[PDB]
């Protein structure tokens, strides 16, 4: 739900050069690097040890007339009893969500370049 | 022997095929990257391209 | 990555300004006078980068400078107990101890002088951003160093980063010079800086006397105010939020117009802690009446009663437990009853943000509130500091030791240069203030 | 079969640095000032055939040969609480009691005079040597006995054991500090020229690094020579490091090189060296640290116009390191692009994790020490080749040159080594840009 914004805004200000491109040049190594990076360089990396090794990136579909901003997603794996907690409703729910915040924070930095 | 035989045409040339070996390796590299996050290639990669010698031959082989 | 923003201490009141508002960041994230982070504070969620450097030794070290062209308030930063929490690299400190004299000209000349010691310091900061936002530059706009070092140091800095924001702490005097000085840091903030925040003087004393209790304020309560205030706009900073988490956001929010960039403060509770002020429960609508009040604006603008001066924009950043829905319960009864006057050129903007406080600033009330308004009431200030600058000038008033600096050396073009943006900059207010805006510049 | 080194201490100033080295290496082995190991040493971990010798009473002997011209140094040896450590049949001393003077030409002419004493000794070490490495000479390349004694035993050495390398730590003397040798600029240029053309690597030792190292992060106000050779020591010591703990890979200095220096002409490495003073310092921290300019240890000019670069850095980090701090800090400078290299071949950055001796005190957790082959050393080798330039348009101090035999005649050879000088700067500034490849 991007509740530390300001892990999330620095990393797409690192991430424009990156995410400005079409997306289906985009592979998750590079992006899962670029979090990691974001992370450490931001508060993000005092994040629960537990929720970081969990804490995965998530491409979208590859459709072409998109670029990296589009496709790039977070993801969060579960397992053990936390998996009893989150099931598959609640994870397509938060892709959802994330699908419109993401979006609308892509429309935020648009306006603050403008 | 055969590379004995050109005193600089021979290094060249043995140049040349450990280039283009050093190529398919680092292609196969990253191919085993890209199938088990193996940080081993991603160490690989930043090492051999970090001054950029190797960078703009591994991204042009990759397009 | 970091969002750093530079705090830029200019002059003997900008300087002590920022070392209040160091000492009360510090005190808002848990770390020591020497920028150690307090073992109760030690795991913060806040992100400290933004406004403060983090040393090796897990010292936080402020993205300040302190510069003074005397040794006496410079060495009493330093001899400050923040001393160790500032980076001494970061405090140039001019050897010509001539100083400015309180005339912008000489201010210039001298941030002339020193422009590579001071932008070597500026780099070096922006280099140890991962991602400068911005520099908010504290400064007085009638004395010789903020107004014309300030002047000089707003064009060094948009040259230097076009597209970092240029925040100002713009102080506005109570020196026969000083209209000048006043008309000259006018036209820089104007035409150097992205957004100037007033700081009137009058208006924060007689907040301080009125509500404090203070007779005559000293400069130490002043700088306490201005900390507190600071604090209060940067608490979306030190706290990470969902929205709105940058400078450029919040410039974006208030400023819609580069040159309309004079932005009114705002703080509510307005009382020194010593007004324990009884048993009443601060509602949001309470707060937004209290904030909404003009005696508890620490600006003095005139109430111009044939001028329909209005709100440009109005955030009201709520800090403390606050239930969001009286927040908007608030904002509603606000709406209905039409407590302030927007412009009429663009859509109402009032905004409510509820936001935590620092855990490590004591704070006696359980909800405070600061609103950072864009009111078209400024151009009043703007209006009385030309009638200032047209007083001097119109007397040739203390115009001789302008033209012992280069600014005014030859003529005084750049004072009624500096006159001329002020009075376009104040009738540009007045027609932001008027529906017609929209087609004013068209 | 052990791969020995043998140390060479020329002159004062080597003798100086080898006798601290010997303190060094006593210490990290737990040897006494008589070469006989200490009782709490007799379980260590360490490789010491690599780089110390035993003697029959199971003393750990160094494989050191002091061999001054003037009596000051050796005899200094032989009077410090280590003269027992080392063999006194390895201490050369020149019954020509005149040294080089700093005199590049007497320290040759020395050289040449102790050729046959030199080679003879040198073949002895080497007959009592199962597997010898090589050699280092620790000399000055601006004195007369470390430039011109340093120049002859480089050149003898290549001709007597033109298998074996030969690597000269060569001090080169404060550039900030007026030289008392007017002729010091000549002298620096013959060595610079000897390193050039005769040896595999040249370690440049700059006075003027010492002196800004000591005031900026030891906080030494006029350091004194006792506290740069415990500095000297302290970096012998870290470079014996993968030597005395065993690892998997790069165990030895030979295969060190041949990782480090693709191009045999550019064999000039700086040091670093962090904690430099008189928290647990993680990995990141470290390479931060040593990519700190206040933990270099070579002064290069900051020539703008030249974007130097690394061609190459090693980090030996010691002590107590996790991995994935390593990991992590790795990942880090790169994103930082905390070190500028090469243009014409890939950055390479190793990053060695080592030990510390049990018997020498760390007061740091974790210590790093950089070695970087970096363009800016061109900028000492343009210094030097101007200073020459300086000396010899003017004939400045040339009559003792004149007096010696190497320039009795002419200073040809000074010439050739201005020459060889402007070149390596050039070639040094070429190295830092991708032309490099075609710009000798």
Same mark, same amino acid.
């Given at each position: %739900?991007?509740?530390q914004?300001?892990?999330?805004?620095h990393?797409?200000? %690192?991430?424009?050069?990156?995410?400005?491109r079409?997306?289906?040049?985009?592979?998750?190594?590079?992006?899962?690097?670029?979090?990691?990076?974001?992370?450490?360089?931001?508060?993000?990396?005092?994040?629960?040890?537990?929720?970081?090794?969990?804490?995965?990136?998530?491409?979208?579909?590859?459709?072409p007339?998109?670029?990296?901003?589009?496709?790039?997603?977070?993801?969060?794996?579960?397992?053990?009893?936390?998996?009893?907690?989150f099931?598959?409703?609640?994870?397509?729910?938060?892709?959802?969500?994330?699908?419109?915040?993401?979006?609308?924070?892509?429309?935020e930095?648009?306006?603050?370049?403008? | 022997?055969?590379?004995?035989?050109?005193?600089?045409?021979?290094?060249?040339?043995?140049?040349?095929?450990?280039?283009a070996?050093?190529?398919?390796?680092?292609?196969?590299?990253?191919?085993?990257?890209?199938?088990?996050?193996?940080?081993?290639?991603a160490?690989?990669?930043?090492?051999?391209?970090?001054?950029?010698?190797?960078?703009?031959?591994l991204?042009?082989?990759?397009? | 990555?970091?969002?750093?923003?530079?705090?830029?201490?200019?002059?003997?009141?900008?300087?002590?300004?920022?070392?209040?508002?160091?000492?009360?960041?510090?005190?808002?994230?848990?770390?020591?006078?020497?920028?150690?982070?307090?073992?109760?504070?030690?795991?913060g969620?806040?992100?400290?980068?933004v406004?403060?450097?983090?040393?090796?030794?897990?010292h936080?070290?402020?993205?300040?400078?302190?510069?003074?062209?005397?040794?006496?308030?410079?060495?009493?930063?330093?001899?400050?107990?923040?001393?160790?929490?500032? +980076?001494?690299?970061?405090?140039?400190?001019?050897?010509?101890?001539?100083?400015?004299?309180? +005339?912008?000209?000489?201010g210039?000349?001298?941030?002339?002088?020193?422009?590579?010691?001071?932008?070597?310091?500026?780099?070096?900061?922006?280099?140890?951003?991962?991602?400068?936002?911005?520099?908010?530059?504290?400064?007085?706009?009638?004395?010789?160093?903020?107004?014309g070092?300030?002047?000089?140091?707003?064009?060094?800095?948009?040259?230097?980063?076009?597209?970092?924001?240029?925040?100002?702490?713009?102080?506005?005097? +109570? #020196? #026969?010079?000083?209209?000048?000085?006043?008309?000259?840091?006018?036209?820089?903030?104007?035409?150097?800086?992205?957004?100037?925040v007033?700081? /009137?003087?009058?208006?924060?004393?007689?907040?301080?006397? /009125?509500?404090?209790?203070?007779?005559?304020?000293?400069?130490?309560?002043?700088?306490?105010?201005?900390?507190?205030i600071?604090?209060?706009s940067?608490?979306?900073?030190?706290?990470?939020?969902?929205?709105?988490?940058?400078?450029?956001?919040?410039i974006?929010?208030?400023?819609?117009?580069?040159?309309?960039?004079?932005?009114?403060?705002?703080?509510?509770?307005?009382?020194?802690?010593?007004? #324990?002020?009884?048993?009443?429960?601060?509602t949001?609508?309470?707060?937004?009446?209290?904030?909404?009040?003009?005696?508890?604006?620490? #600006?003095?603008?005139?109430?111009?009663?044939?001028?329909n001066?209005?709100?440009?924009?109005?955030? +009201?950043?709520?800090?403390?437990?606050?239930?969001?829905?009286?927040?908007?319960?608030?904002?509603?009864?606000?709406?209905?009853?039409?407590?302030?006057?927007?412009?009429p050129?663009?859509?109402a903007?009032?905004?409510?943000?509820?936001?935590?406080?620092?855990?490590?600033?004591?704070?006696?009330?359980?909800?405070?509130?600061?609103?950072?308004?864009?009111?078209?009431?400024?151009?009043?200030?703007?209006?009385?500091?030309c009638?200032?600058?047209?007083?001097?000038?119109?007397?040739?008033?203390?115009?001789?030791?302008?033209?012992?600096?280069?600014?005014?050396?030859?003529?005084? /073009?750049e004072?009624?240069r500096?006159?001329?943006?002020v009075?376009?900059?104040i009738?540009?207010?007045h027609?932001?203030?008027?529906?017609?805006?929209?087609?004013?510049?068209?």
């Open positions: %739900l991007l509740g914004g300001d892990f999330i805004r990393l797409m200000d %690192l991430l424009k050069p990156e995410l400005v079409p997306a289906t040049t985009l592979y998750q190594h590079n992006l899962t690097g670029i979090l990691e990076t974001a992370v450490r360089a931001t508060n993000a990396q005092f994040d629960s040890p537990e929720i970081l090794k969990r804490l995965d990136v998530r491409l979208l579909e590859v459709s007339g998109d670029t990296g901003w589009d496709v790039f997603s977070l993801d969060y794996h579960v397992d053990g009893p936390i998996a009893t907690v099931t598959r409703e609640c994870m397509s729910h938060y892709l959802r969500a994330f699908n419109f915040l993401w979006r609308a924070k892509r429309v930095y648009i306006l603050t370049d403008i | 022997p055969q590379l004995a035989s050109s005193f600089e045409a021979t290094i060249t040339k043995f140049d040349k095929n450990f280039s070996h050093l190529l398919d390796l680092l292609a196969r590299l990253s191919i085993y990257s890209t199938s088990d996050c193996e940080h081993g290639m160490s690989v990669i930043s090492r051999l391209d970090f001054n950029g010698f190797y960078t703009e031959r991204e042009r082989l990759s397009a | 990555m970091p969002r750093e923003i530079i705090t830029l201490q200019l002059g003997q009141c900008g300087n002590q300004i920022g070392f209040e508002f160091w000492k009360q960041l510090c005190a808002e994230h848990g770390i020591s006078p020497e920028g150690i982070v307090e073992e109760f504070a030690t795991e969620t806040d992100r400290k980068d406004f403060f450097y983090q040393a090796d030794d897990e936080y070290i402020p993205r300040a400078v302190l510069l003074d062209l005397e040794p006496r308030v410079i060495h009493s930063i330093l001899n400050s107990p923040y001393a160790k929490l500032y +980076n001494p690299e970061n405090i140039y400190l001019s050897e010509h101890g001539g100083g400015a004299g309180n +005339n912008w000209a000489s210039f000349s001298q941030g002339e002088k020193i422009h590579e010691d001071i932008f070597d310091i500026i780099d070096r900061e922006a280099d140890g951003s991962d991602s400068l936002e911005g520099f908010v530059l504290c400064h007085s706009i009638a004395g010789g160093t903020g107004s070092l300030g002047s000089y140091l707003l064009e060094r800095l948009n040259d230097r980063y076009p597209k970092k924001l240029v925040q100002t702490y713009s102080v506005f005097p +109570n #020196v #026969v010079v000083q209209p000048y000085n006043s008309l000259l840091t006018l036209k820089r903030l104007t035409q150097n800086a992205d957004c100037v007033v700081l /009137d003087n009058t208006a924060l004393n007689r907040i301080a006397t /009125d509500r404090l209790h203070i007779q005559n304020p000293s400069f130490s309560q002043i700088n306490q105010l201005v900390s507190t600071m604090s209060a940067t608490t979306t900073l030190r706290y990470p939020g969902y929205m709105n988490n940058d400078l450029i956001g919040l974006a929010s208030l400023i819609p117009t580069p040159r309309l960039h004079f932005l009114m403060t705002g703080y509510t509770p307005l009382t020194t802690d010593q007004s #324990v002020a009884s048993v009443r429960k601060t949001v609508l309470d707060v937004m009446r209290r904030l909404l009040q003009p005696k508890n604006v620490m #600006v003095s603008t005139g109430r111009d009663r044939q001028t001066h209005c709100y440009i924009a109005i955030l +009201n950043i709520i800090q403390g437990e606050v239930d969001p829905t009286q927040v908007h319960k608030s904002l509603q009864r606000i709406r209905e009853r039409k407590l302030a006057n927007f412009i050129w663009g859509p903007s009032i905004q409510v943000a509820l936001s935590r406080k620092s855990p490590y600033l004591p704070s006696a009330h359980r909800v405070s509130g600061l609103m950072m308004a864009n009111h078209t009431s400024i151009s009043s200030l703007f209006e009385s500091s009638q200032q600058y047209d007083k001097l000038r119109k007397r040739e008033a203390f115009l001789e030791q302008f033209r012992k600096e280069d600014i005014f050396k030859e003529n005084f /073009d004072l009624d500096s006159r001329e943006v009075q376009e900059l009738d540009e207010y027609a932001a203030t008027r529906p017609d805006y929209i087609s004013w510049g068209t």
